[PDB]
Amino acid sequence: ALHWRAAGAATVLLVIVLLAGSYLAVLAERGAPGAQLITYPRALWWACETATTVXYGDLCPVTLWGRLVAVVVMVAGITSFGLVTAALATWFVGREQERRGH
Amino acid sequence: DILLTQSPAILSVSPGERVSFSCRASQSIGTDIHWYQQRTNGSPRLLIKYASESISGIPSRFSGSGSGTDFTLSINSVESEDIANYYCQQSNRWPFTFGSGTKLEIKRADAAPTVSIFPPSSEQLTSGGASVVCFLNNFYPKDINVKWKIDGSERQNGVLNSWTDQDSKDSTYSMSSTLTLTKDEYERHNSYTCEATHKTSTSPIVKSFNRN
Amino acid sequence: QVQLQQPGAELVKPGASVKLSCKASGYTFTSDWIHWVKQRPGHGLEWIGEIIPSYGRANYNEKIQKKATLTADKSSSTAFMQLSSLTSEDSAVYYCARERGDGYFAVWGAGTTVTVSSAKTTPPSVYPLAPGSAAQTNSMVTLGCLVKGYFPEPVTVTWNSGSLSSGVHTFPAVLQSDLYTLSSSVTVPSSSWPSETVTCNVAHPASSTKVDKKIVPRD
Ligand SMILES: CCCCCCCCCO
Ligand SMILES: [K+]
Ligand SMILES: [K+]
Ligand SMILES: [K+]
Asked: Where in this protein would one find the motif Selectivity filter, according to its record (chain A)?
């Protein structure tokens, strides 16, 4: 099934974005005075709460590239969760047509 | 940037007594503080990471505490090997910053200096020089005075002194006095005397050799 | 094994440049950052800058003068710091440290003692220090070595190749017309000398000099 295939592809891609985003955020934020997103472990946590939209506000990017990385994490997170929902819709719709006799 | 304040700069304590180093940040940094130890002529060594987390290899004697602004490094019953400088470091905001540092001193019992005098070597006299070296080792407190006498007469010229920091093995101090003379002037004398005055003895400890 | 290897010393003339090295070993991750710390004599630790070898990006302490330039070689796992236009202010011990990207410096290097001067490199002269003929000793006996006339700092003095550590004192060097001088003390049981060989080991990294001098009675 395509909907379950694209969903799985979205989840694995999300994990890649989370890891890479955690790596790129630190690389981008270091060098800017006052930045807190400068260590990998908490950067990964930041990526999670960002991708899930959430955004406690305990950690936030202050640089241009750190914020661009953030946007990518947001979109990847929203798209994946939106794709899972879309996949769940197809499963339920296809199932309802079966118990109806259509 | 984040300013880390370490006061006092020097911390005196008796052996086998709990001590506490202070580190205050200009901003709230959670628990993102790290402690290091630097002995004399040595590299810094990680003692505590993230305020309270222990490090493999470091004695259980060392502990850490605090969060936000105030942080504390503690040592349960200090030992002579703990004689060093202690620095704190934050990793909450870029850039990373260090504290001014705190020096640890141990107030042990009084000890008389062990005085030894050494005549110039054969290899040195060949070069055309002569240095009479005197060692004043393992005394406490560090307050001490060394006097040089040549043939009964006091000598001050050509005398270089050097004091060590508090020894990290017995919490004592040591100094060396080197009387550097040319070969010729060393020939024209016979008796060389190293004289040490310390609070452990009203009479000065005297070591002397004769150019036989 | 030693995770960070730095040169012992570097002598630089005022205005010239120097490229310090930091050969790294042990575990190496792409999340590793190499830092550089400056420590002037009598002063505390001062952060210079950082660099991530896996990407090559470097950041510097903008609170101080821009004297350094950080580069890295992923092939030999060695970090480099380019110091240019050096003055007397830049004379200090420069450490390199490894951070796992988690904030703390797990391991440090031995540090490179950089001396900025117009003088010349001078090998040290090591002389034995045996007690006089009329010197009475107890259960313990004190020997020594005289490191005379060298430049610049530092020198490393060990007794019997490090095997003899207890009861060893090495005094700070004194400066006399662009020449340093120090002495090293050692205390062993009187019944052990000279039945057992006592030898000091003096190393002068600034001139690649390492000599040994056995301590024998005066005769
Ligand atoms: C989109 C990801 C780019 C990674 C950002 C690196 C920026 C380096 C800071 O100058
Ligand atoms: K939301
Ligand atoms: K908030
Ligand atoms: K939603």
From this structure: 53-58
